[PDB]
Amino acid sequence: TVFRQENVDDYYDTGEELGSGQFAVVKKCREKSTGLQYAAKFIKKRRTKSSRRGVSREDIEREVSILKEIQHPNVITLHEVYENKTDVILILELVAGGELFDFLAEKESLTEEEATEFLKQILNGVYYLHSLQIAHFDLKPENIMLLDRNVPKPRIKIIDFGLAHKIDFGNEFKNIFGTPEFVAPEIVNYEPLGLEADMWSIGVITYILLSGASPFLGDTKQETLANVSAVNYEFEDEYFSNTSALAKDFIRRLLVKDPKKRMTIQDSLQHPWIK
Ligand SMILES: Cc1ccc2c(c1)c1c3c(c(C)cc1n2CCCN)C(=O)NC3=O
């Protein structure tokens, strides 16, 4: 697909850097015509099959494709897409609030009820995504951003659709992932994937949201992958002493090895802990 060929620097005033990845850099920017602030994600094109650097066109095309289809309050919105000889620039909505977990670290421990306030927003967004048969495939704290952190009840936005996929009938999908600590066993054992994987991550995220401790993070990468696969974790009284029974039951119904037995996003919204 053909993207905007004009130089992004002709319509935007690129500036400060917000974050860096192996094949991408996101800089803050200001649109010249509106004076509005956005986020500029510079994805490095592979532009040479043999090369293991840069991202493949197919992968970029897919993220853009999914992004273009998204339109929900709890999901980042794609503004424009430019490209030149080396990069594909995605002008994304700006979540000036930064990471939800950084904002939370700056306040007194949230009550379980307040924690649920944020989690619900996450669920809403994932509810939208799964309703569109789209799996994020990379849900993790760092991808839970805040639109504005200087407001009564800050809004959360799910970002990074680089791993997102359009789950369609007819053909199974084997593997694609990131951080072991947050992926589901299906991903670890390269077994067929689906919307269930996102639900697993949700359970992992709520667990951290409540205890502040990761449920599967081990000493070595291998240990984590083994912890996740063996689906072994615990609600050690040290961290889950002030955690309701309903809270734990929610996490339990999500941290299930067998996908078909795991709670669906529809179920989670109806769970008594969420009410
Ligand atoms: C205010 C702020 C700070 C850091 C940001 C971002 C925004 C940010 C943004 C986006 C992405 C993909 C990465 C981003 N990062 C990198 C870190 C993501 N955990 C994005 O799509 N919008 C952002 O504001």
Per the domain annotation, does 2 fall within a domain?
no
Spatial contact of 93 and 39, defined as CB atoms under 8 Å apart: yes
Per the domain annotation, does 1 fall within a domain?
no
Spatial contact of 24 and 42, defined as CB atoms under 8 Å apart: yes
**Dihedral-angle region of residue 24 (phi above 0 means left; psi in -120 to 50 means alpha; beta otherwise):** beta
Do both 23 and 116 map to the same domain?
no
Residue type, 119: L
How many other CB atoms sit within 10 Å of the CB of residue 106?
8
| Overall resolution, Å | 2.6
Do both 66 and 105 map to the same domain?
no
Rounded Cα distance between 219 and 180, Å, is: 12
Do both 145 and 243 map to the same domain?
yes
Rounded Cα distance between 102 and 27, Å, is: 19
148 lines ligand 1 (CB under 6 A): no
- The DSSP secondary structure of the chain, one letter per residue, reads ---B-S-HHHHEEEEEEEEEETTEEEEEEEETTT--EEEEEEEEB--STT--SSB-HHHHHHHHHHHHH---TTB--EEEEEE-SSEEEEEEPP-TTEEHHHHHHTSS---HHHHHHHHHHHHHHHHHHHHTTEE-S---GGGEEES-SSSSSPPEEE---SS-EE--TT---------GGG--HHHHTT----THHHHHHHHHHHHHHHHSS-SS--SSHHHHHHHHHTT-----HHHHTT--HHHHHHHHHHS-SSGGGSPPHHHHHHSTTT-
269 lines ligand 1 (CB under 6 A): no
26 lines ligand 1 (CB under 6 A): yes
Rounded Cα distance between 246 and 32, Å, is: 50
Instruction: Assign residue 252 the CATH number of its domain.
Output: 1.10.510.10
Nearest to 215 by CA among 195, 177, 243, 190: 243
- Residue 60 domain boundaries: 7-97
Q: Ligand 1 mean position to 134 CA, how many Å?
A: 21
Do both 58 and 149 map to the same domain?
no
Do both 79 and 102 map to the same domain?
no
Query: What is the chain's length?
Result: 275
Q: Is 160 annotated as a binding residue?
A: yes
Can you read off the two tokens belonging to residue 169? 């009938």
**Dihedral-angle region of residue 137 (phi above 0 means left; psi in -120 to 50 means alpha; beta otherwise):** left
All residues at 6 or more sequence positions from 150 whose CB lies less than 8 Å from its CB, including other chains: none
Q: Ligand 1 mean position to 18 CA, how many Å?
A: 6
Count how many domains the chain has. Answer: 2
96 lines ligand 1 (CB under 6 A): yes
92 CA: nearest ligand 1 atom: 21
Q: Whose CA is nearest to atom 1 of ligand 1?
A: 96
C-alpha R_g of the chain: 19
157 lines ligand 1 (CB under 6 A): no
Can you read off the two tokens belonging to residue 203? 């359970």
Rounded Cα distance between 91 and 18, Å, is: 13
How many other CB atoms sit within 10 Å of the CB of residue 69?
12
Can you read off the two tokens belonging to residue 137? 């495939």
Rounded Cα distance between 130 and 260, Å, is: 15
HEC readout, 5-16: CCCHHHHEEEEE
Q: Whose CA is nearest to atom 19 of ligand 1?
A: 142
Q: Which of 97, 115, 141 is the last residue of a domain?
A: 97
Rounded Cα distance between 103 and 87, Å, is: 32
Q: Which of 97, 122, 143 is the last residue of a domain?
A: 97
Do both 141 and 224 map to the same domain?
yes
This structure was determined by X-ray
Q: Whose CA is nearest to atom 4 of ligand 1?
A: 18
Per the domain annotation, does 139 fall within a domain?
yes
Query: Residue 146: what are its φ and ψ, rounded to 5°?
Result: -120, 130
Q: Is 49 annotated as a binding residue?
A: no
All residues at 6 or more sequence positions from 268 whose CB lies less than 8 Å from its CB, including other chains: 123, 199, 202, 250, 253, 254, 274
Q: Ligand 1 mean position to 19 CA, how many Å?
A: 7
- Beta-bridged to residue 27, according to DSSP, are 17, 40
Q: Is 21 annotated as a binding residue?
A: yes
Catalytic residue among 138, 148, 168, 267: 138
Do both 135 and 255 map to the same domain?
yes
Nearest to 116 by CA among 253, 10, 218, 246: 246
Rounded Cα distance between 65 and 162, Å, is: 11
Do both 217 and 142 map to the same domain?
yes
Spatial contact of 67 and 47, defined as CB atoms under 8 Å apart: no
Q: Whose CA is nearest to atom 16 of ligand 1?
A: 19
End-to-end CA distance of the chain: give it in Å, rounded. 44
Do both 137 and 261 map to the same domain?
yes
Residue 96 burial (C-beta neighbours within 10 Å; 0-12, 13-18, 19+)? middle
Instruction: Assign residue 91 the CATH number of its domain.
Output: 3.30.200.20
Do both 70 and 146 map to the same domain?
no
Q: Which of 78, 97, 116 is the last residue of a domain?
A: 97
Catalytic-residue membership of 138: yes
Spatial contact of 26 and 15, defined as CB atoms under 8 Å apart: no
Q: Ligand 1 mean position to 232 CA, how many Å?
A: 32
Q: Is 20 annotated as a binding residue?
A: yes
Per the domain annotation, does 25 fall within a domain?
yes
Rounded Cα distance between 123 and 173, Å, is: 24
Do both 63 and 169 map to the same domain?
no
Q: Is 258 annotated as a binding residue?
A: no
Do both 19 and 130 map to the same domain?
no
